[PDB]
Amino acid sequence: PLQQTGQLFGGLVRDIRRRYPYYLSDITDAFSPQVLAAVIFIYFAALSPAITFGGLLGEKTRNQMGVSELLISTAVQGILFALLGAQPLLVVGFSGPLLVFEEAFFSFCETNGLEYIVGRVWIGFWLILLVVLVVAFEGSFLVRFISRYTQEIFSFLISLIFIYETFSKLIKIFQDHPLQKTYNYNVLMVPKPQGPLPNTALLSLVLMAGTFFFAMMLRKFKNSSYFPGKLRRVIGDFGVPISILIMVLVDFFIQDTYTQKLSVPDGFKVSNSSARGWVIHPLGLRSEFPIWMMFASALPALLVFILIFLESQITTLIVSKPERKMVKGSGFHLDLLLVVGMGGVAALFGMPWLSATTVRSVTHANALTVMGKAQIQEVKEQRISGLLVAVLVGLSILMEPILSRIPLAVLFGIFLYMGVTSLSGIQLFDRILLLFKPPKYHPDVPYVKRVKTWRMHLFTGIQIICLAVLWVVKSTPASLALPFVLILTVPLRRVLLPLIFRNVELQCLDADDAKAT
Amino acid sequence: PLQQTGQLFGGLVRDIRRRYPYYLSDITDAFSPQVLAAVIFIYFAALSPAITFGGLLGEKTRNQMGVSELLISTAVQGILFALLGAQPLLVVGFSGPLLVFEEAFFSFCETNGLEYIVGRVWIGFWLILLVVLVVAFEGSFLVRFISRYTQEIFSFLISLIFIYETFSKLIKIFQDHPLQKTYNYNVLMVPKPQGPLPNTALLSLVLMAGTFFFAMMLRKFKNSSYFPGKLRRVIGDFGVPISILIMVLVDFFIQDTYTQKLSVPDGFKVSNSSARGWVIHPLGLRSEFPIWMMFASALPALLVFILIFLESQITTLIVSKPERKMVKGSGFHLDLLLVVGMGGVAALFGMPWLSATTVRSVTHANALTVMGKAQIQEVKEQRISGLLVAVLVGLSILMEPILSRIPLAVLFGIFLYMGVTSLSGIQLFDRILLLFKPPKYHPDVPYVKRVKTWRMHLFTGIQIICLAVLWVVKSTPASLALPFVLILTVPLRRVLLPLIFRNVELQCLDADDAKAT
Amino acid sequence: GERVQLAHHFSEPEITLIIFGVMAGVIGTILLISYGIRRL
Amino acid sequence: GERVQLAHHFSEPEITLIIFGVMAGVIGTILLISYGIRRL
Ligand SMILES: CCCCCCCC(=O)OC[C@H](COP(=O)(O)O[C@@H]1[C@H](O)[C@H](O)[C@@H](OP(=O)(O)O)[C@H](OP(=O)(O)O)[C@H]1O)OC(=O)CCCCCCC
Ligand SMILES: CCCCCCCC(=O)OC[C@H](COP(=O)(O)O[C@@H]1[C@H](O)[C@H](O)[C@@H](OP(=O)(O)O)[C@H](OP(=O)(O)O)[C@H]1O)OC(=O)CCCCCCC
Ligand SMILES: *[C@@H]1O[C@H](CO)[C@@H](O[C@@H]2O[C@H](CO)[C@@H](O)[C@H](O)[C@H]2NC(C)=O)[C@H](O)[C@H]1NC(C)=O
Ligand SMILES: *[C@@H]1O[C@H](CO)[C@@H](O[C@@H]2O[C@H](CO)[C@@H](O)[C@H](O)[C@H]2NC(C)=O)[C@H](O)[C@H]1NC(C)=O
Ligand SMILES: CC(C)CCC[C@@H](C)[C@H]1CC[C@H]2[C@@H]3CC=C4C[C@@H](O)CC[C@]4(C)[C@H]3CC[C@]12C
Ligand SMILES: CC(C)CCC[C@@H](C)[C@H]1CC[C@H]2[C@@H]3CC=C4C[C@@H](O)CC[C@]4(C)[C@H]3CC[C@]12C
């Protein structure tokens, strides 16, 4: 897949010839209740970040791009990616770095009197130019140099960010409604409670912990030895929907206490009807758009392309490791082209560009993975699950009575479950656990039995340094430099590590498919 | 141990020659941090039942016996039983059936206008006559007729009762402080809050759940492969004190929310100094005690003896099973003599008579158990832990400033931990889990590989009906007939089970030391 | 004891020693009877 | 659109068609150059 042919669009055609022969199985293989449970899981796992990022974007951009634009863009891009992409298991959605770039670009446009939405239109115009030239010259062949080192650093860091944000949301809930001796019994509720309320933070913590506990217990019950095997596996596959339903009913039967619920817009309309329409004029909405910003948009477009490229390509690498039993192939050239082109086209309509998010795609792949008698057996590689997820995300506006009764705390527990379960296949997470284990308890794996224990701990500590450096950069105003610092791990692995490690040590520690050299 | 020697006081003599030679090891074997952790555990595990039952007894008898009398009696009898008893691991304390008898006798005395505390004095006087005759004729040899059947039924039922009451206390906390939109912010707090308060019920639930979670996680960490082994075992042994400390600190740092605390009396004084003193006249306090009630007190003395004998002897059977690796021996004749004689003596001082309770003694035995590399290796058999527990219960009145900062919810979590960890060695509970497993996952044990699966499930279902009948009897005004209904299980095993089960099946299902017939 | 209590002929140690003496006599008599049985 | 928009000579489909045509011309020029290179 990563071979450089030398033919124009050669990788794109081979990606088209690799996956599209399997198109018939991509519909038939989804005829199992495990796929339906995965659909229910990924619907919330994609809808809640969409709503949160849409609200944040609307607040930070004066509703030029809000919840409705993000929902519609997510639905349309997910549908078109599932129906056409070479790796349907990816989930296309908005991410944190994209939000940071949106804030930076809105600040820059507010400084220089530029129209934000038109600048985004021109950035999306320059996005399509870059990805086409990249696919033409097979620029997606450089992803063969992202070894398990960078993949696991990126995945572990993103999982830690997800867990940290999940806990910080509960911290914010406890800050909004602190535990007091006395409260005001008549506090305005519209739009949100203007003052602290009793029993709110504690019930939110209870619901979040209960959802996480039920999800983990049902995940254990899946591998357990209780009940008939078919019924047990059916119930275990539906662990997240069962936990969500249980905690939603629990909160529903407590009428008096206020808990924050899911909020969806009234209709499929623009978030600011006085700012923009559905189509944004490239020459300007109110004022004549400057000619120089049409050419000056290339550099922000370059940064956006770098962000989306790194995110989507590393996500494709992670979800398509050979050890996950992916026997249907993944197309690096086709998926990048579809994602960046859809982002550029959606820019023309004032809608966000999206990327293959790591946590959502990993959770989708995990929910579609069948376990043998501890051992990965097969993966439900099909297009129906992502298509139904995107359709439901689009229909979220229509199903407000169902969503209005779902507390955010339940979804916080689901987020924590996703974050802790995304650490399964990471060898960096395994080698971090070996820091707190005596050497006699280490499992029999190639990086243990052919590398000295202190050498392995030094190798893990070097990655921990990289994780700390990346985490500090995230919490700084220069958090858009994360892709370049992440790329800087590749010279570290392929240049500096051979200066202090032997070939057999690096082969055991940094292996393409967990092989003993 | 349970053989009949045929000599007067023969059983008592053999018990002293069996255990008292180990008296030097009974002090030296306690020089280990696991013993100190067991002391800290069983201190709360015995103090909280003391305070709760003393408060209830004072409520139900107008403080003729209350918290202080129960605390003093528990401390003194525990000290004496630890220094002189043949099974030091038992925890001597008040129990539910004794409280039921106290209420019934108080109602009887109030109906007849008799002095309740003097009637207790005369019952205790008749108690010493019975126990002296029973030990003289070796009446404790009938213990050998109570097999694993009755022992496991009684233990499983008592653990279920403990878990049920631990949850019903939290339910009562929720009932007295319901979740409401409006609370009266000025509610009198002395002596207890007279109206609902915010955040109390949910914080109590959070504290109980967190205590249980930390206890279970530290128990898992004990058997894990993390940390240096000595440090790992030191942390795991102190798991319950660490959980108590963590949750107590968590509640301590939450100043505004009210949680109910441990409340000991102000000092060593009788609960109602307007009614009786420390010494009760056998002839009467206010009126001349009737002559006929002195002779008629034998029947309540018989009932009390039946209750104490059954509970204490079955507890001694449970804690000294051969699969628990007790290599020091236990005396049934000496322990019954000490317990019932001390109870009769304590009746004179207006103090409760106690019994060897199942849950506390099993928890004390488990806290002193050393697990090998799954397999029980040895038990820290010593008299120091029980002596220190009794001393601390006696000093509980003086250490009010430390005890008053510990919430009841933390203790509820600890009691849930005790209940779930007291079901381990019961083979009835192990067979109940086999009702929900496929036969291919049943373990390779004699009662599975020699009895048909449907036969084994029938045998488990017969014991379940006994549990349901015993649970029904507990919830009726005739709850003091429970020992007789439990005694009726002995003919069921020895008469009716041979009518439906083969000899090999009966031997494997009801085995004294878990052997293959 | 506590408060005002009726005065009996025997104090608490006296009556409790009488009760213990009667109890010991009964126990000894029962042991003597049991020893007399099982032999003749 | 929404509110009042500044009037342009080219409508939105016309201007986006012109932009796509210029982009296609640039990409075609680059591809033709790349075809020219690596052969001479
Ligand atoms: C509610 C469901 C029905 C309740 C009615 C209860 C009546 C009822 O359902 O029993 C029939 C069936 C017994 O048949 P049986 O034990 O042979 O069924 C085996 C069971 O399904 C295993 O889980 C399978 O192994 P795995 O998991 O794939 O590895 C195994 O397949 P295989 O590998 O050998 O080829 C099967 O053979 O059930 C039970 O399994 C016992 C547990 C029943 C406990 C039910 C307690 C509610
Ligand atoms: C705070 C601790 C000190 C931190 C400084 C960290 C530096 C540090 O102190 O480690 C040195 C020491 C090495 O000594 P070592 O590996 O020989 O210690 C073995 C270890 O304790 C096993 O658990 C024991 O088996 P078990 O449990 O009885 O069955 C085994 O006993 P045995 O059967 O062979 O006779 C012991 O030999 O500890 C470690 O194990 C390394 C992992 C430490 C993890 C790093 C700390 C989490
Ligand atoms: C929609 O956009 C308009 C203008 O882009 C916003 O109106 C502005 O509101 C800010 C905040 O007070 C101020 O600059 C002015 O009051 C308004 N400016 C102009 C030029 O009208 C409006 O608030 C936005 N609506 C929403 C819901 O975000
Ligand atoms: C201590 O005991 C006395 C009696 O000895 C209790 O006083 C009785 O209280 C009940 C309930 O009000 C009524 O029967 C009478 O008011 C009292 N009876 C007599 C004979 O005086 C007193 O309540 C007890 N103290 C506590 C705290 O329960
Ligand atoms: C098992 C023990 C308590 C012995 C059984 C009780 C019987 C046999 C004994 C023990 C204590 C005895 C009482 C002790 C003191 C007196 C006061 C006296 O003016 C009349 C007789 C009377 C009331 C005695 C009657 C008999 C008595 C009740
Ligand atoms: C990669 C894609 C976006 C092409 C790069 C953009 C540059 C080369 C092109 C694309 C569209 C072009 C514009 C098309 C039409 C007009 C209107 C005319 O009255 C002035 C020039 C102006 C404003 C052009 C300037 C140059 C321009 C902005």
Where does chain A break, by residue before each gap (C–N > 2.5 Å)?
373
What are the C-alpha distances in Å from A437 to residues A176, A376, A422, B219?
A: 40, 26, 22, 17
Q: Is the CB of B63 under 6 A from ligand 4?
A: yes
Amino acid at B425: G
Residues B298/B119, Cβ–Cβ less than 8 Å: no
Atom of ligand 2 minimally distant from the CA of B228: 21
Nearest CA in chain D to A130: D27
Looking at the complex, does the CB of residue A515 fall below 8 Å from at least one CB of chain B?
no
Distance from CA of B65 to the nearest CA of C (A): 14
Structure tokens at A229: 């095997």
Q: Is the dihedral of CA B229, B232, B234, B237 positive or negative?
A: negative
Nearest CA in chain A to B440: A225
* C-alpha A446 – ligand 2 centre gap (Å): 22
Chain A adjacent subunits, 3+ CB pairs under 8 A: B, D
Of ligand 4's listed atoms, the one at least distance from the Cα of C3 is 5
**Touching, B vs C (3+ Cβ pairs under 8 A):** yes
Q: After which residue numbers is chain B interrupted with C–N beyond 2.5 angstroms?
A: 373
Alpha-carbon distances of A225 from A237, A368, A385, rounded to whole Å? 15, 21, 29
* β partners of residue B376: B371
Of D5, D6, D15, which is closest to A282 when you measure between CB atoms? D15
DSSP-assigned beta bridge partners for residue A92 = A356
Q: Check if B372 has its Cβ closer than 6 Å to any atom of ligand 2.
A: no
Cross-chain residue pair B180–A256, CB shorter than 8 Å: yes
State the pairing for strand pair A355-356/A92-93.
antiparallel
CA of B276 to the centre of ligand 4 (A): 12
Residue C39, CB half-sphere, CA atoms under 13 Å: how many?
A: 6
Ligand nearest to the CA of B110: 4
SS (H, E, C) A367-435: HCEEECCCCEEEECCCCHHHHHHHHHHHHHHCCHHHHCCCEHHHHHHHHHHHHHHCCCCCHHHHHHHHH
Sign of CA pseudo-dihedral B448, B452, B453, B458: negative
Residue B353: helix, strand or coil by DSSP? coil
Within 8 A by CB and 6+ apart from B339, the residues are B77, B81, B92, B308, B312, B354, B355, B356
Q: Minimal CA–CA distance to A463: which of A419, A497, A440?
A: A497
Distance CA B42, CA B36 (A): 10
Q: What do you get for the CA distance between the two ends of chain D, in Å?
A: 52
Q: Which atom of ligand 4 is nearest to the CA of B62?
A: 28
Q: In whole angstroms, how far apart are CA A360 and each of A394, A412, B258?
A: 17, 14, 41
Which mutation among A223, A227, A232 tests ligand 1's pocket best, with the greatest number of atoms within 8 A of CB? A227
- Tokens in use for A458? 């030094």
- The identity of residue B25, as a single letter, is S
Pairs from B440-447 (Cβ < 8 Å, separation ≥ 24): B441/A225, B445/B514, B446/B508, B446/B511, B446/B514, B446/B515, B446/B516, B446/B517, B447/B508, B447/B509, B447/B511
User: Is the CA virtual torsion B420, B423, B425, B430 positive or negative?
Assistant: negative
Q: Which residues of B touch C (CB under 8 A)?
A: 8, 125, 128-129, 132-133, 136-137, 270, 273-288, 348
Which residues on neighbouring strands pair with residue A378, listed in sequence order? A370
Residue whose CB lies within 8 A of the most ligand 3 atoms, among A272, A273, A280, A286, for a mutation test: A272
Helix (H, G, I), strand (E, B) or coil at B337: helix
- In this structure, what DSSP letter does residue B275 have? T
Q: Do A274 and D1 touch (CB under 8 A)?
A: no
CB contact under 8 A, B183 and A198: yes
Cβ neighbours for A57, distance < 8 A, ≥ 6 positions apart: A65, A66, A70, A94, A99, A102, A352
Round to whole Å and give the CA distance between B280 and B284.
8
Alpha helices (runs of H) in A195-273, residue ranges in sequence order? 200-223, 229-237, 239-252
Cα distances from B159 to residues B40, B43, B165, B210, B357, in angstroms, run 21, 19, 10, 21, 11
Cβ–Cβ of C6/B273 closer than 8 Å?
Answer: no
Residue positions counted in chain B: 517
With residue B370 as reference, give the H or E element that holds it.
strand B369-371
Q: How far is B337 from chain C (nearest CA, A)?
A: 15
Query: Per the structure block, which two tokens stand in for A459?
Result: 């190798």
C interface mutation test: which of B12, B132, B271, B272 has the most C CBs within 10 A?
B132
Cα of B233 vs centre of ligand 5, distance in Å, is 59
CA torsion sign for A301, A271, A44, A244 is positive
Atom of ligand 5 nearest to the CA of B125: 3
**Cis-peptide into A191, omega within 30 deg:** yes
Distance (Å) of CA A5 to CA A135, D31, D33: 12, 16, 18
Nearest by CB: C2 against B128, B277, B348: B277
Q: What is the DSSP string of B77-131?
A: HHHHHHHH-S-TT--EE--HHHHHHHHHHHHHHHHHT--HHHHHHHHHHHHHHHH
- Closest ligand by atom to A63 CA: 3
What are the distances in angstroms from CA B223 to CA B127, B185, B230? Answer: 46, 48, 12
The ligand with the least distance to the CA atom of A64 is: 3
With vertex at residue D18, the alpha carbon angle to CA D13 and CA D20, rounded to the nearest 5 degrees, is: 90
| CB atoms near residue A79 (< 10 Å) | 19
Is A377 in contact with A370 (CB distance < 8 Å)? yes
Q: Which ligand is nearest to the CA of A439?
A: 2
Interstrand relation of B376-379 and B369-371 (parallel, antiparallel or unpaired): antiparallel
Hey, whose CA ends up nearest to atom 12 of ligand 6? D19
Q: Give the CA distances from residue A161 to residues A91, A102, A389, A418, in Å, rounded to whole numbers and listed in that order.
A: 18, 19, 24, 12
Cα–Cα distance measured from residue B191 to residue B261, given in angstroms and rounded to the nearest whole number: 12
User: What resolution in angstroms, rounded to 1 decimal?
Assistant: 3.2
Q: Supply angle C-alpha A269, A271, A272, rounded to 5.
A: 110
- Check A181 against B438: CB less than 8 A apart: no
Q: Cβ(B285) to ligand 4 under 6 A? A: no
